[PDB]
Ligand binder design. Structure first.
Ligand code: HEM
Ligand SMILES: *[C@@H]1O[C@H](CO)[C@@H](O[C@@H]2O[C@H](CO)[C@@H](O)[C@H](O)[C@H]2NC(C)=O)[C@H](O)[C@H]1NC(C)=O
Ligand code: NAG
Ligand code: NAG
Ligand code: NAG
Ligand code: CA
Ligand code: CL
Ligand code: K
Ligand code: ZN
Ligand code: ZN
Length: 595
């Protein structure tokens, strides 16, 4: 609320109700309600927002005001007391590859983005926030607690800007602040293509009628394509190594260059689109560029859907997969397709799956050169290590043969993210993602832990003893109670991640329920779901069923050896097979003549 830095450009389109293609914005998916799921609308609220003043001020804004009669603990202080740990030994997930973590970030970026308020460029507001740690309007700084080492080294706070929100509209009667989702709620490869028509065009190759995406014209990966550079300045990716001065990539998603392995995945996906287009041009020489672009975009969309539901969700949701996502029963035009506010915090479980280092491996999956293993923080906004240090293949190999971090109640978020995160506007490897997540929960008016437990029909701990029983962990419960006084006040991000994981899964009960429900809706509420009859032919669906991430790698790199199950932990060579033995996508069902 209170208008400063609100709104987004929602472009009005008349719906082509008969198009076999998704729109870019996500409009027209739901025929009765064409905006449901579209980009640049409010996140859905599963429960009403909870703000200090009932409208817009986050809990923790006014020093005097309590939450349920208790002060809320500083976000950095929760992080120090609970989230950090020293020893990386034994922290790794023994049955999940690094690809597990990375795929999660990909799915997340496809579904939701809540950009920070653009106070504008040229800001004295940035100055008053960063330099003076002054709370006001969109500046909601993360203040360091007493004895924080960052006090001695960084200042009084980390700057933090409140998320973007829907503008008050002409009733202007009083409503709670609603944050915006800038990307389409459908699992539709929007992170590749854009959620905005203008960028979508700019990303395409329109010089040729071949339906390709634009590729870098200054650099190649042993003949294979790189994303175009983003030429907007100043560039964080340039900042981190001004000698090398390699800019960030330009993708369908703003966040693509945040870390080297995300940039990698974005590259594999772009390569795939162009491969699909070239193949379809071979099968159908008469098809034009629009047709080629749309059809390859349509396939790549389904590819993301299949990998997520067949390979990813089962090993996240474990024993709960069946309870939340039973066999598909066809498109339901009454299901809300929109991403919920709470989901965007629930999906941040992946922050506990990121390890402290990244490795480049050679063709024998051995350490590549003398600086094979790098600390994670050196790779935020890092495109030079790709362009000028060996391409994507060495990184892809580590994705396959290295492991995700396991979530650990005693070892939650690695120091690389908890102390050394680099933010694109700022200049220091000095931020705390865990403190940011907690602050952001408050920013977004998140109801508290016991609110969500109830939403999910789970017991709601009220005492230390009750929480110890929920957490199966005495010390964690006690530290939580000392900080929060009441489990009612525990911020949803820390609360949900504190729970021991469900059987065969990588999240606890509360999170399994929140994620499960959202993924159910994402499938059932999508008119272009790949399994919705008429979206693909039957023969095409039979082809699609054979897609795998291993094939994507084989088709789009010079790696010739891959595991069959890329998401589990795999060791070279025993678990790797030659690419020739891996199922391909058969495109013959897309062949199209007139006779
Ligand atoms: C750097 C960051 C990562 C890797 C080194 C990383 C990783 C993940 C995974 C694996 C996720 C899902 C399984 C995931 C989800 C979401 N993230 Fe997170 N992430 C890195 C950095 C960030 C930053 C910075 C943010 C913004 C924090 C803020 O509130 O201002 C961030 C957010 C999220 C998020 C909310 C929406 C979004 O931007 O993705 C997730 C669902 N991540 N990340
Ligand atoms: C857009 O598509 C055209 C045509 O495929 C690309 O042009 C060719 O690019 C390759 C690689 O640079 C060359 O080997 C060919 O000789 C080029 N042929 C033509 C028709 O010029 C062009 O590079 C693509 N543009 C972008 C920006 O991705
Ligand atoms: C790793 O997880 C997958 C889950 O589908 C399972 O099939 C595989 O056997 C697991 N390996 C283990 C638990 O060691
Ligand atoms: C910057 O890149 C150059 C090569 O471009 C390299 O030799 C140097 O180590 C890099 N410096 C930093 C700051 O990482
Ligand atoms: C579809 O959606 C609504 C709300 O989820 C539900 O009541 C209804 O039972 C569903 N109908 C079918 C046919 O699945
Ligand atoms: Ca999307
Ligand atoms: Cl919500
Ligand atoms: K993110
Ligand atoms: Zn090569
Ligand atoms: Zn700064």
């Amino acid at each position: 609320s209170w208008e400063v830095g609100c709104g987004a450009p929602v472009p009005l389109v008349k719906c082509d109700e008969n198009s076999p293609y998704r729109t870019i914005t996500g409009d027209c998916n739901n025929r009765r309600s064409p905006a449901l799921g579209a980009a640049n609308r409010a996140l859905a609220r599963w429960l009403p927002a909870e703000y200090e003043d009932g409208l817009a001020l986050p809990f923790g804004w006014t020093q005097r005001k309590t939450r349920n009669g208790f002060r809320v603990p500083l976000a950095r202080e929760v992080s120090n007391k609970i989230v950090g740990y020293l020893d990386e030994e034994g922290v790794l997930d023994q049955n999940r590859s690094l690809l597990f973590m990375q795929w999660g970030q990909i799915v997340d970026h496809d579904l939701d983005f809540a950009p920070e308020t653009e106070l504008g460029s040229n800001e004295h507001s940035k100055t008053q926030c960063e330099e003076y740690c002054i709370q006001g309007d969109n500046c909601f700084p993360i203040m360091f607690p007493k004895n924080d080492p960052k006090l001695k080294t960084q200042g009084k706070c980390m700057p933090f800007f409140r998320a973007g929100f829907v503008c008050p509209t002409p009733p202007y009667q009083s409503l709670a602040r609603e944050q915006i989702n800038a990307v389409t709620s459908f699992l539709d490869a929007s992170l590749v293509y854009g959620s905005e028509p203008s960028l979508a065009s700019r990303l395409r190759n329109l010089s040729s009628p071949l339906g390709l995406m634009a590729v870098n014209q200054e650099a190649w990966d042993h003949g294979l394509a790189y994303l175009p550079f983003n030429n907007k300045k100043p560039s964080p990716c340039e900042f981190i190594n001004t000698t090398a001065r390699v800019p960030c990539f330009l993708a369908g998603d703003f966040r693509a260059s945040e870390q080297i392995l995300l940039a990698t995945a974005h590259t594999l996906l772009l390569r795939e689109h162009n491969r699909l287009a070239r193949e379809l041009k071979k099968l159908n020489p008469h098809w034009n560029g629009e047709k080629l672009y749309q059809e390859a975009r349509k396939i790549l969309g389904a590819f993301i859907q299949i990998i997520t539901f067949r390979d990813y969700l089962p090993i996240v949701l474990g024993s709960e997969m069946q309870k939340w996502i039973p066999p598909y029963q066809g498109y339901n035009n009454s299901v809300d397709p929109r991403i919920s506010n709470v989901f965007t915090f629930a999906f941040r479980f992946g922050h506990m799956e990121v390890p402290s280092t990244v490795s480049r491996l050679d063709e024998n999956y051995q350490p590549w050169g003398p600086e094979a293993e790098l600390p994670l923080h050196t790779l935020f906004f890092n495109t030079w290590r790709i362009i000028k240090d060996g391409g994507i293949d060495p990184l892809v190999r580590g994705l396959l043969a290295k492991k995700s971090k396991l979530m650990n109640q005693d070892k939650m978020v690695t120091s690389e993210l908890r102390n050394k995160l680099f933010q694109p506007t700022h200049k220091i490897h000095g931020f705390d993602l865990a403190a940011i997540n907690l602050q952001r929960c408050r920013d977004h008016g998140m109801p508290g832990y016991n609110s969500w437990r109830g939403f999910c029909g789970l017991s709601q701990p009220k005492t230390l003893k009750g929480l110890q029983t929920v957490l199966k962990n005495k010390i964690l419960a006690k530290k939580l109670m000392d900080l929060y006084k009441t489990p009612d006040n525990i911020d949803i991000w820390i609360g949900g991640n504190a729970e021991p994981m469900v059987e065969r899964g990588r999240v606890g009960p509360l999170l399994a329920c929140l994620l499960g429900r959202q993924f159910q809706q994402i499938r059932d509420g999508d008119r272009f779901w790949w399994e919705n009859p008429g979206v693909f032919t039957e023969k095409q669906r039979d082809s699609l069923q054979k897609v795998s991430f291993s094939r994507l790698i084989c088709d789009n790199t010079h790696i010739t050896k891959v595991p069959l199950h890329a998401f589990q932990a795999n060791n070279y060579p025993h678990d790797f097979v030659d690419c020739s033995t891996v199922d391909k996508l058969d495109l013959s069902p897309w062949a199209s003549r007139e006779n």
